[PDB]
Design an enzyme around this catalytic site. Structure first.
Site, PDB file in Angstrom:
ATOM      1  N   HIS B  41       0.738 -92.371 -25.558  1.00  0.00           N
ATOM      2  CA  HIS B  41      -0.084 -92.147 -24.366  1.00  0.00           C
ATOM      3  C   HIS B  41      -0.266 -93.407 -23.507  1.00  0.00           C
ATOM      4  CE1 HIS B  41      -3.579 -93.346 -27.053  1.00  0.00           C
ATOM      5  NE2 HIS B  41      -3.854 -94.032 -25.958  1.00  0.00           N
ATOM      6  N   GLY B 143      -9.493-100.088 -25.470  1.00  0.00           N
ATOM      7  CA  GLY B 143      -8.582-101.206 -25.633  1.00  0.00           C
ATOM      8  C   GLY B 143      -7.955-101.294 -27.003  1.00  0.00           C
ATOM      9  N   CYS B 145      -6.448 -99.038 -28.965  1.00  0.00           N
ATOM     10  CA  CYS B 145      -5.282 -98.243 -29.355  1.00  0.00           C
ATOM     11  C   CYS B 145      -4.094 -99.139 -29.661  1.00  0.00           C
ATOM     12  CB  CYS B 145      -4.915 -97.244 -28.264  1.00  0.00           C
ATOM     13  SG  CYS B 145      -6.152 -95.942 -28.191  1.00  0.00           S
TER      14      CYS B 145
HETATM   15  C1  LIG Z   1      -7.014 -95.925 -26.621  1.00  0.00           C
HETATM   16  O1  LIG Z   1      -6.106 -95.217 -25.747  1.00  0.00           O
HETATM   17  C2  LIG Z   1      -7.115 -97.315 -26.106  1.00  0.00           C
HETATM   18  O2  LIG Z   1      -7.569 -98.173 -26.835  1.00  0.00           O
HETATM   19  N1  LIG Z   1      -6.634 -97.439 -24.868  1.00  0.00           N
HETATM   20  C3  LIG Z   1      -6.824 -98.593 -24.014  1.00  0.00           C
HETATM   21  C4  LIG Z   1      -6.408 -98.204 -22.600  1.00  0.00           C
HETATM   22  C5  LIG Z   1      -7.498 -97.337 -21.989  1.00  0.00           C
HETATM   23  C6  LIG Z   1      -7.371 -98.806 -21.589  1.00  0.00           C
HETATM   24  C7  LIG Z   1      -8.369 -95.234 -26.794  1.00  0.00           C
HETATM   25  C8  LIG Z   1      -9.256 -95.765 -27.925  1.00  0.00           C
HETATM   26  C9  LIG Z   1     -10.546 -94.950 -28.029  1.00  0.00           C
HETATM   27  C10 LIG Z   1     -11.527 -95.296 -26.906  1.00  0.00           C
HETATM   28  C11 LIG Z   1     -12.898 -95.391 -27.588  1.00  0.00           C
HETATM   29  N2  LIG Z   1     -12.617 -95.446 -29.010  1.00  0.00           N
HETATM   30  C12 LIG Z   1     -11.330 -95.254 -29.280  1.00  0.00           C
HETATM   31  O3  LIG Z   1     -10.817 -95.316 -30.389  1.00  0.00           O
HETATM   32  N3  LIG Z   1      -8.026 -93.851 -27.064  1.00  0.00           N
HETATM   33  C13 LIG Z   1      -8.169 -92.993 -26.073  1.00  0.00           C
HETATM   34  O4  LIG Z   1      -8.668 -93.319 -25.007  1.00  0.00           O
HETATM   35  C14 LIG Z   1      -7.723 -91.589 -26.332  1.00  0.00           C
HETATM   36  C15 LIG Z   1      -6.571 -91.224 -25.406  1.00  0.00           C
HETATM   37  C16 LIG Z   1      -7.043 -90.096 -24.498  1.00  0.00           C
HETATM   38  C17 LIG Z   1      -8.513 -89.860 -24.818  1.00  0.00           C
HETATM   39  N4  LIG Z   1      -8.820 -90.713 -25.966  1.00  0.00           N
HETATM   40  C18 LIG Z   1      -9.939 -90.730 -26.687  1.00  0.00           C
HETATM   41  O5  LIG Z   1     -10.039 -91.356 -27.736  1.00  0.00           O
HETATM   42  C19 LIG Z   1     -11.042 -89.863 -26.150  1.00  0.00           C
HETATM   43  N5  LIG Z   1     -11.399 -88.895 -27.160  1.00  0.00           N
HETATM   44  C20 LIG Z   1     -11.055 -87.620 -26.995  1.00  0.00           C
HETATM   45  O6  LIG Z   1     -10.830 -87.197 -25.865  1.00  0.00           O
HETATM   46  N6  LIG Z   1     -10.986 -86.873 -28.100  1.00  0.00           N
HETATM   47  C21 LIG Z   1     -10.795 -85.427 -28.200  1.00  0.00           C
HETATM   48  C22 LIG Z   1     -10.578 -85.049 -29.659  1.00  0.00           C
HETATM   49  C23 LIG Z   1      -9.550 -84.990 -27.444  1.00  0.00           C
HETATM   50  C24 LIG Z   1     -12.019 -84.692 -27.681  1.00  0.00           C
HETATM   51  C25 LIG Z   1     -12.260 -90.615 -25.597  1.00  0.00           C
HETATM   52  C26 LIG Z   1     -13.015 -91.340 -26.697  1.00  0.00           C
HETATM   53  C27 LIG Z   1     -11.820 -91.611 -24.531  1.00  0.00           C
HETATM   54  C28 LIG Z   1     -13.234 -89.622 -24.982  1.00  0.00           C
HETATM   55  C29 LIG Z   1      -6.029 -89.809 -25.619  1.00  0.00           C
HETATM   56  C30 LIG Z   1      -6.535 -88.876 -26.721  1.00  0.00           C
HETATM   57  C31 LIG Z   1      -4.656 -89.445 -25.051  1.00  0.00           C
END
Ligand SMILES: *[C@](O)(C(=O)NCC1CC1)[C@H](C[C@@H]1CCNC1=O)NC(=O)[C@@H]1[C@@H]2[C@H](CN1C(=O)[C@@H](NC(=O)NC(C)(C)C)C(C)(C)C)C2(C)C
Ligand SMILES: *[C@](O)(C(=O)NCC1CC1)[C@H](C[C@@H]1CCNC1=O)NC(=O)[C@@H]1[C@@H]2[C@H](CN1C(=O)[C@@H](NC(=O)NC(C)(C)C)C(C)(C)C)C2(C)C
Lengths: 306, 306
Positions: B41, B143, B145
């Protein structure tokens, strides 16, 4: 989100660990620039431990009595000197992996990461606090002397602890990197007891703020308290006094959560007086006191290190 | 003595973390030989997250759309491919710090160390378990991921986890290093719930043996139990079934302590039925289930890693 007992990344310190062998004694040393630091009781023997005179013991030593191994590479010692309870071995080669570093003597209540080592090889890393009675509740077996504790600030390793010994209650005592023991302990097999410990009140409050940041609020209440009235309940439960200076340190956490420091004290008071009644906070059924206000802010905002 | 939640030394993995930037998205990648692994992603945008088709998304990408930074050094991408939910970026330079390594998909109940990272820079290290519902109770901010979980065996890093996402209950889900999610999760913002978790029974028993090794015996009793009769009480308390195979794994610990595995089950049964009544085990007021039998033996006997 989430909250874990987090240690600093250990790589910068891993590259500094060496094996120091003298006589029948092997332990870890810390190789920074061209000096290897290690506990001075490496010069002791099976009957020396009782009341050794390390000045006498060390003048009887030659450089070549010191076997220093950096992996599959043997370091030659070209000088030695004793500073308090640490031995400093001058070697002919400067550690090319020497990080930017400082030696710091920490205050009780402060936390640090311990890189546990045997035979100059790292075994694991975990987070400790300096207890108020100047012990640390570590995980240390025979062989682990010379393992160091540390903090990292951006790119600098601040060494604060070197392991020397275990107390009969299963807790641990050691020195700063200049060889001064934390607490009243001496590196002698004589009767020594840890002293009565107390709970690090400002750290418990930090961890309660961590909990709120992370969605646990069941323990909050509408009450408030004075610092005096708080400290009258703390004393009773063998908690450290909370100072105005602790209050000011808890400022940023108080500001981020919107809970005045004194209101969180009222919550802690009720937790002390009523227990948790079968509930948990941050996955703990105890009030946790080995996170500093800085630890909480670090982990809840994501500071890194290069 | 002592018993701590110990992570593996992190240096071998620290040297592999990089920043991967595509579009408005920045996250961590893992640089091994000439390949950088990161969550797929990273090719998503603010309105892609809802139901993206990553095959379509990726064919629209050029190598030069991928900014990989290894510190103050920019890696050029010369190829890309998707394997399940991970992206593999072929770069023109092989990581000279590449450790000996393996990719392994672990079973629930197994533990590992997580090196939490932001912008390719390590923030901290902690020990996790794969929960029975295939979540991990981590500490992860935006951040993070691409941070990886791992074990080390002598000199080999076994990567088992890469972070992708947080579930609404504050727990975390991710993949192995071949991009297969642990559990039923998908890397889509659609309704997903963690599934009911259970306590890792064989790990609780390991930790009770750790306690005995370390001088806590207040919870022992003269009773014994059958595996059937134990599992009838475990089910009731939302503990995983204990198998004969778990029993055999607990052998060495049973042998070192002199407490038959089935006798320790009788102790755990009474702990489940009566609680701890205001007592602690290994500094915990809860039954701890994120130490494997191997973790206990490692820490209580001092195995190292080179
Ligand atoms: C990860 O993509 C990251 O570290 N990205 C850095 C880029 C954004 C600047 C994050 C890490 C999470 C954020 C908070 N704690 C974490 O572990 N992951 C995500 O942002 C993922 C990616 C889209 C949404 N997401 C989430 O973790 C979200 N949760 C979520 O939507 N979960 C369900 C099960 C679908 C409901 C949320 C925490 C941001 C809401 C992906 C799933 C594609
Ligand atoms: C340390 O010297 C080491 O790792 N050495 C490896 C060399 C021996 C092969 C050990 C580390 C402790 C062992 C178990 N847990 C530890 O942290 N330290 C010691 O062995 C020190 C040194 C002599 C005795 N000692 C102890 O820790 C002992 N405790 C003790 O005697 N304490 C009191 C307060 C004096 C009672 C003991 C655990 C071996 C009994 C030194 C104190 C000089």
């Amino acid at each position: 989100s989430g909250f874990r007992k987090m240690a600093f990344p250990s790589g910068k310190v891993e590259g500094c660990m060496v094996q120091v062998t003298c006589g029948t004694t092997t332990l870890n040393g810390l190789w920074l620039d061209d000096v290897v630091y290690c506990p001075r009781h490496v010069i002791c023997t099976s009957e020396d431990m009782l009341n050794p005179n390390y000045e006498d013991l060390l003048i009887r030593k030659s450089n070549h009595n010191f076997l220093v191994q950096a992996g599959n590479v043997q370091l030659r010692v070209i000088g030695h000197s004793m500073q308090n309870c640490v031995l400093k071995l001058k070697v002919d080669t400067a550690n090319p992996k020497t990080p930017k570093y400082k030696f710091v003597r920490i205050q009780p209540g402060q936390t640090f990461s311990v890189l546990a080592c045997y035979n100059g090889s790292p075994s694991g890393v975990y987070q400790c606090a300096m207890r108020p009675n100047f012990t640390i509740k570590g995980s240390f077996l025979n062989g682990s002397c010379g393992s160091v504790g540390f903090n990292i600030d951006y790119d600098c390793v601040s060494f604060c602890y070197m392991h020397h010994m275990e107390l009969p209650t299963g807790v641990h005592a050691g020195t700063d990197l200049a060889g001064n023991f934390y607490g009243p302990f001496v590196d002698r097999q004589t009767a020594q007891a840890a002293g009565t410990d107390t709970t690090i009140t400002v750290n418990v409050l930090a961890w309660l703020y961590a909990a709120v940041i992370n969605g646990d609020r069941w323990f909050l209440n509408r009450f408030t308290t004075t610092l005096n009235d708080f400290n009258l309940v703390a004393m009773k439960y063998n908690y450290e006094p909370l100072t105005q200076d602790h209050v000011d340190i808890l400022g940023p956490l108080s500001a981020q959560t919107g809970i005045a420091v004194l209101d969180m004290c009222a919550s802690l008071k009720e937790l002390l007086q009523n227990g948790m009644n079968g509930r948990t906070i941050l996955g703990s059924a105890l009030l946790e006191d080995e996170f500093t206000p800085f630890d909480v802010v670090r982990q809840c905002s994501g500071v890194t290190f290069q």
